[PDB]
Design a protein around this ligand. Structure first.
Ligand code: K
Ligand code: K
Ligand code: K
Ligand code: MG
Ligand code: MG
Ligand code: MG
Ligand code: MG
Ligand code: MG
Ligand code: MG
Ligand code: MG
Ligand code: MG
Ligand code: MG
Ligand code: MG
Ligand code: MG
Ligand code: MG
Ligand code: MG
Ligand code: MG
Ligand code: MG
Ligand code: MG
Ligand code: MG
Ligand code: MG
Ligand code: MG
Ligand code: MG
Ligand code: MG
Ligand code: MG
Ligand code: MG
Lengths: 98, 133, 63, 183, 62, 138
RNA sequence: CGAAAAUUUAACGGAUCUAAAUAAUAUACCGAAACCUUGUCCAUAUGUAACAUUAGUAAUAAUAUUAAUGUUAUUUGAUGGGGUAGCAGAACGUUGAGUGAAUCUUAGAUUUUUUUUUUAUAACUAAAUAUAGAUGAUAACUCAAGUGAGAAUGGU
RNA sequence: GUAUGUCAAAAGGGAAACAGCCCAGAACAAGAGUUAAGGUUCCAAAAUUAUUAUUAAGUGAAAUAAAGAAAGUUUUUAUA
RNA sequence: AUAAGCAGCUCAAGCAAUAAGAAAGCGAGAGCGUACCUUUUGCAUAAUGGGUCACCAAGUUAAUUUUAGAUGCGAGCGAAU
């Protein structure tokens, strides 16, 4: 290819910081919705599914925050910043073992 | 009203005793560092004022002299100073034309802007005596 | 730059560090001697009449 | 506008500063402890501080269009501090548009022909705005190999004590104590 | 609407014709459907028009 | 309780369905705040745009007026003295000084009713050739 | 270390950096025509008041009101604001005509210019130069088009 | 072909330069205003800001060359 | 006359009125900006066209058939006596 899409294979310490704070800000949105409903003795199916199969920023490994799964890579790992709309999309869980 | 601090009650006479004084007035939140006699040209047409109206400015961020500087946390107490301005008139700028155009498109949209500005004149800037307060 | 607003942000100079320490809990007066030449109107105490009460120790000594 | 009304003479005057490439610099050094390990400012870290003075960007009246810079007299450029193996492994290049006329030289070989003063000029030169003031600002960098220079009388003073001298600070504070005896 | 009198009028360069087609260069026949046979041919014309029928002026008692 | 929802990010490149979760909430532009009751139908509407909004639990719902007034900046001035003016709909408002407080607006069909000095007033002022200031004041 | 290509260092942007590299963290600051704030322009609404015009309806010998249109302000502290193909609405300007047997002009009509002001594809102020009483110019409203050109290897 | 978006018809900030990527949808101004992506020694607006480790090769620092070799070095887990 | 600008725009020193008053213009220096149109998925493109300026130069007219709005009459309308 001759068209240059200069995208470094790894993120900088500044992109990682904002990524951590974005993953942490989405945790507060769900915690606020989960606690506000508990006061009324109510639950939403989506909130239950999120709190069940999605971890918090303090429970995620560094490799789950900054990389994703890509079968076309030699080690099945790919920079999370290579995902479309990675900043405003939720990606936290990868296949087991990879 | 909240009593003035004891540290400000002892140094204010020294602040007002010096030759010159300046203040940072805040009109609608925007600061303006002015002195008695300056001419402020606000970037907006103050509604409801005619040339000759006297205004009392009550939001001052800093009122200091050469060496001393009085600073209020959000603002300074109005009882310490007295700043007044007078509306001198309204001024306008020359018409500016902005041409919004794209490459390989003949349509050129024009935008004509000619804004008015209110001009003030700081005719009073004095520090009060708070020996009684 | 393209507009006057951008030119102003690039040519910015922050205020003196003394003003950055904005107070809290109320108002205060701080000693801020500028690094500039004083005018001929800051009469030295040696040229003040013996009657002038404004004569007083250095404001630095009041702090 | 009042802030700018006055005598701007001394704000635009050229000040002659001085710095030694061998004196330890607690601020421009990467080592801060122990105090006996504090090194001088490295080549690039010294050039970044000098380029700021040549531009006058340290003045509250700075303007990129106005040449409000100052002079910087650098001494002891022979003992210029460098880390790693930059002295023998770094290379400087040159080309005069003629294919085959590529001139290369290392830092240790460049310090033998034009001394360490040329190594510091190329560093400061690249840190200045690429415009018509680059040659005037760079020309105000007085770099010398040893302790001698023709500007020992130009260096800024405060009470007869050159800035950076043993007792220049106490000479400054003594002059400001007298300036408070006035209204 | 005076077409072809500038871009800011909204009917300027192409005058509302598109870009280099038959509808811009020439004219398409009104009965043309691109080549597909019309229904009048696929189905045919049904009936006849009576040319001998009288035409009465209808009058109501109302 | 209510959900104070504020659109922190945009959805330009997000799918159309995301755009219509934001329309159901009322978030048209960026940094726009809306109030919705704490209910499942609204909680599930936020789980779809949780990467774009900032949620907060508030006791009551704020009116449109109060929300604007949070960001309003102190005027910083007070008109204490107003010169004579002409209100096109009411009439001539005489000079008023709020420092000693009286905005009286006189309307009529004759110069006298307006409350201004007319030509006749200037003639009687010029005929009083006897009035003289007190010697003590002179 | 493996790691070699033909104009020149040659994919750190460059200077340079032993961190100003790398990895795991924390905070501040900068940062767009985004957002907020204070003003302005425009579009579309909603009510109210006042000004002018046109046409009606009443009063008046000792002015009020109704409707339409234009306009300013104001109420909801109203809402809205990139754009090709393309669709739609509202206007300006040019040429000629009607009102016009009208209006204005040596107390300066008209002068391809210059200048000034006004939200302004336009007109206006003033200046300089020259000198016309109508085969001169002209507001407003309306009518009709040989009516608006940096683009056709266009034509003269 | 399919799903989603952008460009096409979208300027602006970031990616050195950039139709399609990351942010964000330009009615006009003012503001050390508040932020996004991105960044903060100098060119160049903002940290030479703090903490714990690694690297000595300018490796690297905004486009990862491979298998492989080896008393390079650090750490861990066994062990003398 | 030390400099690598689609020549504009943002910031702007200085010069410029013999005189009371009155600063248009030119602009050192700093920064931003790779003409226009056509045609294309996409053009600073080394794709098309133009040496410059002025003038001529392209949805018009008729008949017929329709629509919207306004308006006349109205189970009649129109035309003509
Ligand atoms: K390198
Ligand atoms: K040609
Ligand atoms: K024509
Ligand atoms: Mg290429
Ligand atoms: Mg169009
Ligand atoms: Mg069409
Ligand atoms: Mg049509
Ligand atoms: Mg064509
Ligand atoms: Mg077609
Ligand atoms: Mg779109
Ligand atoms: Mg290089
Ligand atoms: Mg906006
Ligand atoms: Mg918009
Ligand atoms: Mg539009
Ligand atoms: Mg003339
Ligand atoms: Mg031609
Ligand atoms: Mg196309
Ligand atoms: Mg774009
Ligand atoms: Mg960079
Ligand atoms: Mg700031
Ligand atoms: Mg800086
Ligand atoms: Mg020269
Ligand atoms: Mg060409
Ligand atoms: Mg002709
Ligand atoms: Mg013609
Ligand atoms: Mg229509």
């Amino acid at each position: 290819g001759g068209l240059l899409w200069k995208i470094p294979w790894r993120m900088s310490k500044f992109q990682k910081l904002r990524q951590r704070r974005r993953l942490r800000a989405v945790d507060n949105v769900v915690a606020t919705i989960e606690n506000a409903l508990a006061k009324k003795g109510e639950t939403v199916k989506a909130v239950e599914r999120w709190r069940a199969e999605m971890p918090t920023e303090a429970e995620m490994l560094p490799k789950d925050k900054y990389t994703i799964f890509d079968r076309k890579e030699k080690r099945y790992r790919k920079g999370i910043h290579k995902l479309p709309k990675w900043t405003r999309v939720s990606q936290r869980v990868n296949p087991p073992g990879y | 009203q909240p009593p003035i601090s004891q540290q400000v009650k002892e140094l204010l006479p020294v602040l007002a005793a010096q030759p010159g004084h300046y203040t940072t007035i805040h009109i609608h939140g925007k600061p303006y560092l002015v002195t008695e006699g300056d001419t402020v040209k606000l970037p907006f047409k103050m509604p409801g004022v005619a040339p000759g109206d006297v205004l009392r400015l009550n939001r001052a961020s800093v009122i200091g002299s050469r060496d001393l500087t009085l600073q209020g946390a959000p603002y300074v107490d109005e009882r310490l100073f007295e700043c007044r301005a007078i509306v001198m008139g309204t001024e306008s700028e020359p018409m500016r034309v902005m041409i919004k155009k794209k490459r390989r498109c003949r349509k050129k949209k024009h935008v004509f802007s000619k804004h008015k500005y209110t001009v003030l004149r700081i005719n009073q800037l004095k520090i009060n005596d708070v020996s009684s307060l | 730059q393209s507009t006057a607003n951008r030119t102003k942000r690039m040519l910015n100079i922050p205020p003196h560090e003394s003003f950055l320490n904005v107070p809290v809990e109320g108002d205060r007066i701080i000693f801020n001697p500028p690094s500039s030449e004083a005018s001929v109107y800051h009469t030295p105490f040696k040229f003040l009449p013996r009657s002038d009460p404004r004569r007083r120790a250095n404001i630095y000594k009041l702090f | 506008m009042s802030q700018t009304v006055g005598a701007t003479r001394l704000a635009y005057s050229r000040v002659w500063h001085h710095i030694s490439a061998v004196t330890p610099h607690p601020t421009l050094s990467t080592i801060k402890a122990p105090s006996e390990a504090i090194t001088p400012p490295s080549l690039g870290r010294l050039a970044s501080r000098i380029a700021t003075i040549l531009m006058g960007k340290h003045k509250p009246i700075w303007d990129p269009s106005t040449d409000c810079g100052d002079y910087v007299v650098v001494t002891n450029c022979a003992g210029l501090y460098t880390t790693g193996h930059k002295k023998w492994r770094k290379t400087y290049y040159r080309h005069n548009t003629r294919p085959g006329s590529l001139q290369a030289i290392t830092m240790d070989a460049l310090m033998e022909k034009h001394g360490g003063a040329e190594v510091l000029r190329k560093a400061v030169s690249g840190m200045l705005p690429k415009n018509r003031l680059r040659d005037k600002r760079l020309a105000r960098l007085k770099a010398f190999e040893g302790d001698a220079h023709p500007y020992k009388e130009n260096l800024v003073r405060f009470g007869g004590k050159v800035v950076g001298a043993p007792g220049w600070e106490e000479a400054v504070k003594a002059i400001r104590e007298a300036d408070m005896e006035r209204l | 609407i005076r077409k072809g009198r500038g871009p800011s009028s909204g009917y300027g360069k192409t005058a509302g014709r598109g870009t280099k087609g038959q509808k811009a260069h020439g004219h398409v026949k009104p009965w043309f459907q691109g080549g597909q046979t019309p229904l009048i041919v696929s189905h045919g014309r049904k009936g006849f028009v009576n040319q001998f029928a009288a035409d009465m002026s209808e009058l109501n008692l109302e | 309780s209510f959900f104070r929802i504020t659109l922190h990010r945009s959805a330009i490149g997000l799918p159309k369905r995301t755009h219509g979760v934001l329309a159901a909430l009322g978030l048209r532009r960026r940094n726009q705040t809306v109030f919705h009751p704490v209910e499942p139908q609204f909680a599930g509407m936020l789980m779809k745009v949780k990467e774009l909004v900032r949620v907060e639990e508030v006791p009551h719902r704020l009116t449109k007026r109060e929300l604007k007034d949070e960001r309003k900046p102190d005027a910083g001035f007070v008109v204490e003295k107003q010169v004579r003016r002409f209100i096109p709909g009411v009439g001539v408002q005489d000079e008023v000084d709020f420092s000693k407080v009286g905005a009286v607006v006189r309307d009529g069909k004759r110069a006298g009713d307006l409350g201004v000095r007319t030509r006749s007033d200037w003639e009687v002022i010029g005929k009083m050739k006897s009035v003289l200031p007190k010697v003590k004041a002179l």
